[PDB]
Design a protein around this ligand. Structure first.
Ligand SMILES: CCCCCCCCCCCCCC(=O)OC[C@H](COP(=O)(O)OCC[N+](C)(C)C)OC(=O)CCCCCCCCCCCCC
Ligand SMILES: CCCCCCCCCCCCCC(=O)OC[C@H](COP(=O)(O)OCC[N+](C)(C)C)OC(=O)CCCCCCCCCCCCC
Ligand SMILES: CCCCCCCCCCCCCC(=O)OC[C@H](COP(=O)(O)OCC[N+](C)(C)C)OC(=O)CCCCCCCCCCCCC
Ligand SMILES: CCCCCCCCCCCCCC(=O)OC[C@H](COP(=O)(O)OCC[N+](C)(C)C)OC(=O)CCCCCCCCCCCCC
Ligand SMILES: CCCCCCCCCCCCCC(=O)OC[C@H](COP(=O)(O)OCC[N+](C)(C)C)OC(=O)CCCCCCCCCCCCC
Ligand SMILES: CCCCCCCCCCCCCC(=O)OC[C@H](COP(=O)(O)OCC[N+](C)(C)C)OC(=O)CCCCCCCCCCCCC
Ligand SMILES: CCCCCCCCCCCCCC(=O)OC[C@H](COP(=O)(O)OCC[N+](C)(C)C)OC(=O)CCCCCCCCCCCCC
Ligand SMILES: CCCCCCCCCCCCCC(=O)OC[C@H](COP(=O)(O)OCC[N+](C)(C)C)OC(=O)CCCCCCCCCCCCC
Ligand SMILES: C[C@H](CCC(=O)NCCC[N+](C)(C)C[C@H](O)CS(=O)(=O)O)[C@H]1CC[C@H]2[C@@H]3[C@H](O)C[C@@H]4C[C@H](O)CC[C@]4(C)[C@H]3C[C@H](O)[C@]12C
Ligand SMILES: C[C@H](CCC(=O)NCCC[N+](C)(C)C[C@H](O)CS(=O)(=O)O)[C@H]1CC[C@H]2[C@@H]3[C@H](O)C[C@@H]4C[C@H](O)CC[C@]4(C)[C@H]3C[C@H](O)[C@]12C
Ligand SMILES: C[C@H](CCC(=O)NCCC[N+](C)(C)C[C@H](O)CS(=O)(=O)O)[C@H]1CC[C@H]2[C@@H]3[C@H](O)C[C@@H]4C[C@H](O)CC[C@]4(C)[C@H]3C[C@H](O)[C@]12C
Ligand SMILES: CCCCCCCCCCCCO[C@@H]1O[C@H](CO)[C@@H](O[C@H]2O[C@H](CO)[C@@H](O)[C@H](O)[C@H]2O)[C@H](O)[C@H]1O
Ligand SMILES: CCCCCCCCCCCCO[C@@H]1O[C@H](CO)[C@@H](O[C@H]2O[C@H](CO)[C@@H](O)[C@H](O)[C@H]2O)[C@H](O)[C@H]1O
Ligand SMILES: CCCCCCCCCCCCO[C@@H]1O[C@H](CO)[C@@H](O[C@H]2O[C@H](CO)[C@@H](O)[C@H](O)[C@H]2O)[C@H](O)[C@H]1O
Ligand SMILES: CCCCCCCCCCCCO[C@@H]1O[C@H](CO)[C@@H](O[C@H]2O[C@H](CO)[C@@H](O)[C@H](O)[C@H]2O)[C@H](O)[C@H]1O
Ligand SMILES: [Ca+2]
Lengths: 228, 228, 228, 228
């Protein structure tokens, strides 16, 4: 209609989204203050009301957006994110997990999707990921196989670190980040299993060498984009 | 013959290797569950049978592959790997080391050699290695010489870390990864040998500087490949 | 006038700034010795006088520079820095914070602004920063949102690390540097909150992946400068 | 003469240096065994004799080399290194420091100078250094200025880490490597000086950011070499 076009030109208004962005940074500050228990004694009700004010506004104005765009809205990854972020924010407290209330803070990520400069940089990062998928596949296979080996080789006498497949996953990722791999994992390990370095020195080497290539690769593919 | 060509067109069948790949991921999951002792009480016999089912299949079908290809098979590094991986998997339990049973998990790496996308990424990594061989030679020489020096300079009062050439190798590699080099090695060292930094600050610097070049080099040689 | 031009050709003299540079390295050494309490017992008065000698000289000769250049001086970032560095150096001891006396050492950074080769390398580094501003914005938003989440999720039972928004900021930056993230933060955390890895493994991953891109980006933009 | 040319064509003989290289790896192994006290009880005299055999040979054959080349020898950095390495190896035990005997192991680095492939890779690394000299100057100035500040700000209550200019240098380098910067330096520091992060978070940032550029720079200058 021209009703649909009236709503649409309010919805795609620059001011409309600048008001939204403004609502985001305001509520962002809000949530910064609600970590403080001092501030929460004084203005607990103030901030808890503002939070509801803004979330209804977001639901009001995602209703409007869906009107304007219908199917195309749900095929847009930025819009989808604002949907599922305001969704998890909608569910009320004391229903399901209580952890859902920390997830309310995800609303702030609307800033990324509402700002164009932020949307540009995110798309640039996400762009890189497809080229990485082979290396990620390889590395996951490598982690999985060594997790099993380490679980089997060390999980009985070292149950906190290797007693479980998932425990070995975590410990192995720790090692890969190089965080206390020697004086916190392998040197203790070796106190019982003196040849444990035979398992972990190669693990280090391979994991490192692969990550280097992961990065080198990303660089090359960015230069191949400039050279066209 | 045309028998040889009949076997060969079953062996090079797409479906044939898709069945193999499928057998790999199945058994991969299997081995994930056999880390669990719960699952092993219930279905111990089930998984231990599946494992034998699949390994015979792999030996059956490496026999077929060798038939089809004979000498050319044993000059292919992917095929060779499947040979020596199914080989170490063949030897029965309680013969030789018992560690051979964790090595059975290496079978999962067949995924890398059976999948073409995985084979591509591995070849890409292995490609990089030849250019690195000079730097690796240098660094090994450097490690060896400092290992000796550190063994001699510190192995008596610090026998757990430097008492042996191999111990100093391990400790020096630890340092290179920067893992607790100061508050776990050098600062304790210095409690007795106050000028120990004179040995380790340069060691750090050289090792770091070389590794940077190792990487920078890899990058350049990848760009020299794009620029042709 | 030609008075103004007489002062100006003394002020822009090569020798003039070589004398200044010389005054900087001398006083640099001075301040190296005044860390020593031995040296301060013997020559305390000597160095404390030299320091005043030189600072008056610097104020004398920033007066001259402002004469020669007036407004253009205050629109130059190198000159501005020498202004505010000699300014904070001017304020006398025991007025305001006492920390202002360590800030006197900032005078040595005049070397960067007085030497041309040093000025070149600093401008090269500062040049890089504008391209980084999107990624920095993103990362700050990401840090802020996870700081809040971590403050809320863990600040009661872990008040030293997550009890405050700013405490969580510091702890999260620690994690990003990978410094004791597992055996000093997450593994203790998990002793009470077993699913804490669900918060921190992703945090690691995202922070790392972004930093890689931060760097990769810098590289590309430097090559885009060579290719013109 | 043609005597000089007779000696010269023995000295520049391929076999001559292959014999030398062979002497190096032999003695390299020797010195590996002399770390072992077992081996030193049995063959102490054997290895200690071999060591003298080879060093005289090296002095014999650096005499020959100097004959062949005279001044040009002493303007070659590879030859110079073999001079000063065999020199420090010449001085006998129990004269001066005893540390001179560990320096005997430096002889093994003759491998780098005697092998051409090794000489190539070393020259490639050393090549990189000139471009780095500005950044190194800057960073040294930065380290020095913060060392002083940290010595003054923290050396009284933290004398093991900051009580001395050189102590602060070491601690600051530790921080730069990120080794236990938080749970081993700054968090303890903060127990007394709660605003200590104001000094160290910026220090981290600047040091990191500079090192990135140090590396990025090296990459660019290597590509500028390929693009000619
Ligand atoms: C479009 C441009 C937007 C520009 C925004 C830039 C934002 C950059 C991040 C700013 C970080 C703020 C500094 C900070 O984290 O402060 C730490 C303090 C210390 O804790 P504090 O609560 O004082 O503890 C005292 C004891 N207590 C609880 C009993 C009162 O904790 C507090 O006191 C709470 C202070 C909350 C300040 C929140 C400021 C953030 C601005 C909004 C961020 C953008 C939202 C999308
Ligand atoms: C953009 C494309 C994708 C990006 C890359 C990420 C994809 C790969 C991620 C790993 C996939 C597998 C996930 C997995 O195995 O998780 C299982 C475990 C189960 O945890 P659980 O046993 O409940 O907890 C263990 C800790 N505990 C008991 C001491 C409290 O959960 C853990 O606790 C382990 C934590 C995960 C370790 C990280 C493994 C990384 C795999 C290699 C990735 C290379 C990155 C380049
Ligand atoms: C071609 C596409 C293939 C796609 C596959 C992608 C695979 C990515 C890695 C997946 C990682 C699986 C998650 C994981 O590690 O779980 C940790 C759990 C926790 O230990 P759990 O055994 O529950 O401990 C409970 C106590 N207990 C032992 C008495 C029962 O440990 C377990 O409960 C055992 C769970 C085993 C799950 C195995 C799933 C891996 C899929 C196959 C991998 C490919 C093989 C080549
Ligand atoms: C793709 C081309 C090749 C890839 C690069 C790898 C080649 C170089 C690897 C090192 C070669 C030398 C191997 C070696 O020296 O190993 C001897 C020692 C003997 O161990 P052992 O004395 O039985 O155990 C010591 C630990 N303990 C007693 C406290 C339980 O074994 C150890 O425990 C030491 C562990 C090895 C330390 C790593 C040394 C790296 C050398 C520099 C490589 C630079 C990489 C870019
Ligand atoms: C344009 C070209 C300029 C070239 C300059 C290159 C500068 C490079 C950095 C040099 C670093 C100097 C070495 C250093 O940090 O020495 C540590 C010593 C050890 O502490 P020390 O004070 O001996 O402790 C003994 C006990 N005590 C206090 C009771 C006496 O601490 C001391 O004894 C104090 C020694 C102060 C030496 C200062 C030398 C720096 C030169 C000026 C730097 C340039 C200024 C812009
Ligand atoms: C050239 C363009 C800009 C360069 C990038 C830098 C800009 C971003 C810096 C962070 C901005 C926000 C600053 C902020 O939130 O500071 C608040 C807190 C308040 O400290 P406070 O609560 O007084 O002290 C906590 C420690 N305590 C209690 C145990 C003694 O202060 C702290 O103690 C936290 C220390 C800061 C943590 C670093 C956060 C980094 C944000 C992400 C930056 C990514 C870098 C690529
Ligand atoms: C041109 C091509 C040259 C190719 C050479 C490649 C060299 C690569 C590095 C090889 C590293 C050798 C492995 C290693 O570090 O072994 C650690 C062992 C363990 O200590 P060990 O002495 O067995 O301790 C037992 C207790 N004890 C002392 C009472 C007997 O310590 C020992 O038992 C001593 C073993 C010494 C073996 C030395 C082998 C190095 C070859 C020469 C290196 C080139 C010299 C330039
Ligand atoms: C290829 C071109 C050149 C390569 C770059 C290297 C040039 C710069 C190196 C540093 C120059 C200044 C040297 C210096 O200040 O050393 C003084 C101190 C004095 O040590 P001292 O007070 O006897 O021992 C302290 C430890 N203690 C008491 C607890 C046992 O000695 C130490 O103990 C401190 C150890 C040195 C810390 C490293 C400082 C690095 C400066 C920034 C370099 C950036 C690298 C990219
Ligand atoms: C575009 C990008 C790479 C191709 C490209 O042109 N970019 C980089 C190549 C140069 C992406 C797009 C499609 C990707 C693969 C497939 O989805 C599945 C594949 C099977 C593995 O088991 C698991 C994931 C694998 C490795 C994926 C990674 C691979 O990387 C591909 C080709
Ligand atoms: C191809 C690659 C480098 C040449 C190239 O074109 N790529 C990079 C050069 C640019 C590879 C192929 C052959 C390699 C060397 C030799 O096998 C032996 C040699 C002697 C050392 O003691 C130990 C290994 C050394 C340093 C090897 C490394 C070197 O790197 C070479 C040339
Ligand atoms: C060649 C290289 C850089 C020039 C170049 O072409 N390469 C990189 C430039 C792009 C080298 C060669 C000569 C170098 C400088 C001088 O010796 C002294 C100078 C004064 C500082 O107080 C201390 C060292 C400085 C910064 C040196 C670093 C600088 O980096 C130069 C120019
Ligand atoms: C790139 C290729 C991949 C390389 C991967 C190869 C990994 C090599 C594995 C080396 C493992 C070293 O770890 C090794 O673990 C076994 C566990 O059975 C120990 O074995 C020891 O403990 C077990 C209990 O678990 C006892 O039953 C056994 O009698 C005893 O010797 C070894 O003493 C230890 O040194
Ligand atoms: C890039 C070039 C390569 C640089 C490599 C040069 C390495 C320099 C070596 C510095 C070593 C410092 O380590 C130094 O070790 C010797 C060991 O003899 C110590 O010496 C001390 O211990 C030994 C026992 O072992 C005693 O016999 C001796 O009387 C005592 O002084 C020094 O107090 C310590 O400071
Ligand atoms: C890229 C996407 C971003 C991913 C970010 C998602 C973060 C996921 C959060 C996982 C957090 C895990 O941390 C989780 O913290 C909560 C705190 O309520 C704990 O919950 C526990 O402690 C709290 C007290 O604080 C009790 O009230 C509660 O009954 C108890 O279960 C969980 O046992 C712990 O595992
Ligand atoms: C990029 C720009 C460079 C940024 C560099 C700026 C560095 C900023 C310095 C912040 C230092 C924080 O460290 C600060 O040290 C002083 C030391 O006087 C402490 O001060 C405290 O200790 C001293 C003793 O030494 C007492 O005399 C004083 O009364 C007390 O307040 C502060 O409580 C602490 O927080
Ligand atoms: Ca660490």
């Amino acid at each position: 209609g021209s009703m649909y076009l009236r709503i649409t030109n309010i919805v795609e208004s620059s001011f409309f989204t600048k008001f939204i962005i403004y609502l985001i940074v305001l509520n962002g500050i809000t949530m910064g203050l609600e970590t403080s228990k001092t501030f929460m004694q004084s203005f607990g009700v103030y901030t808890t009301l503002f939070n509801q004010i803004v979330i209804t506004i977001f639901t009001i104005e995602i209703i409007l957006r869906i009107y304007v765009h219908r199917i195309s809205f749900f095929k847009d990854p930025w819009s989808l994110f604002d949907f599922f972020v305001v969704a998890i924010s909608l569910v009320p407290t004391s229903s399901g997990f209580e952890i859902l209330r920390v997830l309310r803070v995800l609303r702030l990520f609307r800033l990324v999707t509402a700002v164009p400069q932020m949307r540009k940089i995110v798309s640039a990062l996400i762009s890189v990921i497809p080229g990485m998928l082979s290396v990620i596949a390889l590395m996951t296979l490598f982690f999985y196989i060594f997790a099993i080996m380490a679980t089997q080789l060390f999980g009985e006498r070292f149950p906190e670190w290797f007693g479980t497949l998932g425990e070995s996953f975590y410990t192995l990722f720790q090692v890969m980040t190089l965080e206390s791999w020697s004086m916190g994992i392998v040197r203790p390990l070796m106190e019982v299993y003196p040849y444990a370095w035979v398992f972990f020195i190669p693990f280090i080497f391979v994991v490192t060498f692969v990550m280097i290539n992961l990065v080198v690769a990303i660089i090359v593919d960015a230069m191949a984009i400039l050279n066209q």
